[PDB]
Amino acid sequence: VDVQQNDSATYTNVSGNTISEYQRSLATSVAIEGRYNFFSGSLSTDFDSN
Amino acid sequence: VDSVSASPDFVDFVPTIPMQEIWTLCSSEAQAEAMRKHYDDVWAPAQSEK
Numbered sequence: 267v268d269v270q271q272n273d274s275a276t277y278t279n280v281s282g283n284t285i286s287e288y289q290r291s292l293a294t295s296v297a298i299e300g301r302y303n304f305f306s307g308s309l310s311t312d313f314d315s316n
Numbered sequence: 317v318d319s320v321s322a323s324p325d326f327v328d329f330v331p332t333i334p335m336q337e338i339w340t341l342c343s344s345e346a347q348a349e350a351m352r353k354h355y356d357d358v359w360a361p362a363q364s365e366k
Contacts, residue, residue, distance in 0.1 A: 271325050
């Protein structure tokens with residue numbers, strides 16, 4: 267048997283990192299008024315989406 | 317580095333006489349020429365292609 271010295275080392279390192287972020291906002295508002303000498307009217311509407 | 321001082325391994329050639337053809341070690345010129353001719357004409361082309 268023929269034995270040869272072969273003292274050796276190898277190293278490898280691979281890493282990946284990722285972040286993804288998405289954001290949305292929506293706002294809506296409506297205000298209405300109505301007037302008559304013997305009547306008053308008001309309406310409001312509000313909407314929010316995230 | 318301490319281990320390299322105690323146990324260095326073969327890393328590189330001495331560029332003046334790195335290796336000798338094996339048929340230099342042959343018993344006989346007819347065999348040695350046959351080995352050289354086959355090495356030149358057949359085996360070294362194949363290995364360089366391989």
